[PDB]
Symmetry: C3
Subunit: 89 residues, 3 copies
């Protein structure tokens, strides 16, 4: 099966659902008006997510794994950027 | 292995744990007094979840996947209902 | 692939990422200053997580599964303790 991860914020709410399928992760988005495909598209076979609001600004962290490798991706209001996470050391 | 997804709300807290096993997803619940089996029972091989409170009312979204198909299930205070989510388009 | 689960709290934030690899789950931690390996180390092939704050005290629940067995682990300010969760009955 594909593998998903979901997060939400606020009371509208906004929702993001990440799906790993055949080695790629894609993103679907709800902001109160319908579902649309988001900008996030990166390699991975497994995905997890968390998020937090600072006032009205959302911060999202997506953990994309393949084999024994995990890469963190970061949204902080502009774009997706690889983060500093490593699984060890 | 079975695959689980967990969410919580409030400070009691309430917890819900969803488990995919042999193509079915079941639900376990804590509201401060012990664990009990919940009403949610739907097909799926993979599960994710998120939730949010509006005041004192919980909203839960369970994303149930099998193969390349994902179905969203919705709790909004009464019962479980299929949602509008699709993985594409 | 390894399988991960992530939670966060506050606005710093703190983040915890749990990774199941080859039958063991390990923990990585961010509290604003860098990533470090946490104290959590228990058997499991699949992991989920949730957490909640009571004021300034974090409570974390990690659901560690192997085959059809799921064990809950609990952090409530001191250490990791097996919880009362069972998947049925
Ligand atoms: C992608 C990344 O590494 N983000 C870091 C951030 O990097 C800075 C760069 O963005 C740029 O400004 O150059 C400086 C060096 O001069 C840094 O490399 O630095 C932040 C400062 O601590 C990191 O912390 C978070 O920053 C967020 C906003 O960008 C936010 O304020 C958050 O609260 C901070 O903790 C940021 O780290 C990333 O986010 C944290 C939470 C972890 O997920 C970490 O692994 C990420 O890389
Ligand atoms: C199951 C579903 O589709 N729920 C929708 C909801 O559907 C309405 C029906 O419940 C009924 O009232 O008939 C009307 C048309 O006349 C709609 O079909 O409509 C809501 C309005 O936007 C959707 O939005 C959420 O509604 C929640 C309470 O029911 C809550 O207020 C939430 O804040 C709203 O965003 C609701 O969509 C479902 O929930 C959202 C968050 C997504 O998960 C979406 O995919 C779900 O279908
Ligand atoms: C590990 C565990 O079972 N924790 C229980 C907690 O057990 C108590 C023991 O810690 C000790 O004090 O002895 C008494 C009997 O005299 C109990 O066995 O009991 C708490 C009381 O309800 C449980 O509830 C949570 O306690 C947390 C702080 O420890 C916190 O206040 C939380 O809000 C309470 O709901 C605690 O249960 C564990 O946590 C809950 C949320 C579930 O995850 C449950 O399965 C856990 O075992
Ligand atoms: C903050 C926000 O909602 N931005 C929307 C745009 O990006 C989408 O949301 C962010 C948080 C991240 O999940 C992106 O990968 C995602 O595409 C979005 O493109 C736009 C739609 O027209 O709406 C913005 O509000
Ligand atoms: C709001 C709430 O806690 N409702 C409980 C009932 O349903 C359980 O919780 C909801 C949120 C959802 O997870 C259901 O699938 C689940 O069964 C529950 O049946 C009842 C137990 O007697 O207690 C209610 O409070
Ligand atoms: C509350 C807190 O942040 N405690 C830190 C110590 O434990 C780490 O965090 C807790 C919540 C749990 O995830 C542990 O398994 C984890 O190791 C930590 O060891 C210490 C680092 O020097 O810093 C504490 O603040
Ligand atoms: Cl950004
Ligand atoms: Cl409802
Ligand atoms: Cl403790
Ligand atoms: Na989630
Ligand atoms: Na649509
Ligand atoms: Na942008
Ligand atoms: Na969770
Ligand atoms: Na019990
Ligand atoms: Na009902
Ligand atoms: Na998460
Ligand atoms: Na480092
Ligand atoms: Na300690």
């Amino acid at each position: 099966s594909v593998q998903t991860a979901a997060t939400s914020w606020g009371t509208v709410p906004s929702i993001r659902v990440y799906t790993a399928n055949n080695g790629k992760i894609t993103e679907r988005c709800w902001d109160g008006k319908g579902w649309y495909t988001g900008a996030f598209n990166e390699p991975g076979d497994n995905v997890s997510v968390t998020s937090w609001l600072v006032g009205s600004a959302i911060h999202i962290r997506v953990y994309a794994s393949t084999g024994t490798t995990t890469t963190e991706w970061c949204w902080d209001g502009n774009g997706w950027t690889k983060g500093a996470y490593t699984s060890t050391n």
